[PDB]
Design a protein around this ligand. Structure first.
Ligand SMILES: C[C@@H](O)[C@H](O)[C@@H](O)COP(=O)(O)O
Ligand SMILES: C[C@@H](O)[C@H](O)[C@@H](O)COP(=O)(O)O
Ligand SMILES: [Mg+2]
Lengths: 210, 216
């Protein structure tokens, strides 16, 4: 089944823990959001993995350059996965992937903002097996067909695809039949009246649909 | 015409490592950059602490903001940043969002040109009111053997012609400066070529002397 990832887009650890203390056991992947990477630094990764060592911890660092150095900082802090931003020089992505393999982790290319299909082919040739597809800034409404198409295309290229960007529970059926690797929910879990029910509804719907 | 300024990149994983540098060269350079490595290593406290130490200097947070432009720029400015970076592939409204916050704090935004981007995007930045870009040779590219070429000079001049103040960066060495002579470079960034020098003070002073000669 598609896994469920909670995005901790919080500025401080104590703010993140308001969420993890409710839903850490209700999700598969705990993301240190970019906000939290910048707010607290790599200690966020270390602390969250120590708390939840049975979960996959993703550092959403959106690495733009210095692939080897930044990825090593994250993996030394016990990250499982890290993100590299889509416009990074291809050697950045390769650098991050080489380090990831030393730690038995993985790299995802984060498809935030402008990227091209030629670049996608480069990442595939480079050995990248994961991408994160985002619904756009302004787009946030309704997951449109151009997204679905792009997602299927990335899937057909051999990427495990993550779906992200204001994801709501009701969006899930649009992706039926596509082997989505992960669905990310940040606000739709963190800011729900009941974060536990929000996470459980996501998991229930995924199980119905796949 | 004005001399290019000199910016030290603090690409240190911890504050104490950064301080081993700033205690030597704070007064030898114009801009103190909190490198991406330091922002990720220590968080945005790196910005607050460095500005507290050096309140008279321009402090740049090299956050390379890709998304959530208002939130991430506000975090940096509330930590007393002067300038923040936004990575080139960011949605135009991301850049605009960072700039709106920047103007609230009487700061500014640079677009970081690391890795792939287009001339359509650049006009978008100008129309949006962005007045600074960082022409970056990727550090990973440089390790893979990418050198400063003709194409880099053509691109830089063209960005300059569009009305951007251009910063040059990426493995910059003292001997690279003459390649840029006759172009109104706004800033040169030196990370390793200052931090890792036998004498960081003398390294910085050499960059300053060469700049004064080449652009005087
Ligand atoms: C923008 C991105 O990195 C966020 O973490 C996103 O993927 C998930 O958060 P939301 O569901 O709140 O949009
Ligand atoms: C990649 C970039 O952000 C670095 O700070 C760079 O601009 C300056 O450091 P170097 O002079 O060590 O390449
Ligand atoms: Mg994220």
């Amino acid at each position: 089944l598609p896994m469920l990832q909670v995005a901790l887009d919080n500025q401080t650890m104590d703010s993140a823990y308001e969420t993890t203390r409710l839903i850490a056991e209700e999700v598969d992947i705990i993301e240190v959001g970019t906000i939290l990477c910048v707010g607290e630094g790599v200690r966020a990764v270390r602390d969250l993995k120590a708390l939840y060592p049975h979960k996959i911890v993703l550092a959403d660092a959106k690495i733009a350059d210095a692939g080897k150095i930044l990825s090593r900082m994250c993996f030394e802090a016990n990250a499982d996965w890290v993100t590299v931003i889509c416009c990074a020089d291809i050697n950045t992505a390769k650098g991050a992937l080489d380090v990831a393999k030393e730690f038995n982790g993985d790299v995802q290319i984060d498809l935030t903002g402008y990227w091209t299909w030629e670049q996608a082919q480069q990442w595939r040739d480079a050995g990248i097996g994961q991408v994160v597809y985002h619904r756009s800034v302004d787009a946030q409404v309704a997951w449109g067909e151009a997204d679905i198409t792009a997602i299927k295309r990335l899937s057909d290229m051999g990427f495990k695809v993550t779906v992200a960007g204001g994801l709501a529970l009701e969006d899930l059926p649009l992706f039926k039949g596509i082997p989505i690797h992960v669905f990310i929910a940040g606000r739709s879990i963190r800011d729900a009246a009941s974060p536990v029910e929000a996470a459980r509804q996501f998991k229930r719907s995924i199980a119905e649909l796949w």
